[PDB]
Amino acid sequence: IKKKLPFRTRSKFPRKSECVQDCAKAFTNGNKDKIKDVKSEFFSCYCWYE
């Protein structure tokens, strides 16, 4: 399932690693393993997880 990252990322176009960790904090209580995909966006990026 897909959500937008709630808040502004520390980097303009965050890297896949940056996005997976941001999604982990936002939606999986920091558990990176449950984040199944990421899509970089401007000061934001989209999160895919179960």
Binding site: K12, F13, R15, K16, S17, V20, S40, F42
Partner: protein
């Protein structure tokens, strides 16, 4: 050999055609350079995420062409940017900036 006198002496549609063709040729040549570097680094193959690209988000020749336009005209959208991974990208960035300033200056002086 008196090439700049010819370039000034061309009638205005001819001069505009020369300068837009020179800018387009420089953009396409360095687009080919960026695309070749991105292939040779493996950035064109989809990858999970261990390695970092020379230039971010270069997925095809269209990305390389947009990036070459961005660096030469210094717009710099930043979706595709040079990283510190391969020094060949840094060298090509230096060369493209130098020749972009050079041919921009040549065109600028000719039509002045």
């Amino acid at each position: 050999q008196d090439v700049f006198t010819t370039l000034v002496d061309l009638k205005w549609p001819h001069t505009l055609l020369i300068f837009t063709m020179s800018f387009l040729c420089s953009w396409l040549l360095f687009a080919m350079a960026w695309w070749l570097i991105a292939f040779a680094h493996g950035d064109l193959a989809p990858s999970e995420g261990t390695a970092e690209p020379c230039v971010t988000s270069i997925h095809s020749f269209s990305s390389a062409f947009l990036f070459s336009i961005e660096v030469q005209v210094t717009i710099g959208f930043g979706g595709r940017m040079v990283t510190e991974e391969c020094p060949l990208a840094i060298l090509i960035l230096i060369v493209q900036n130098i020749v972009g300033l050079m041919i921009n200056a040549i065109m600028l002086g000719c039509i002045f």
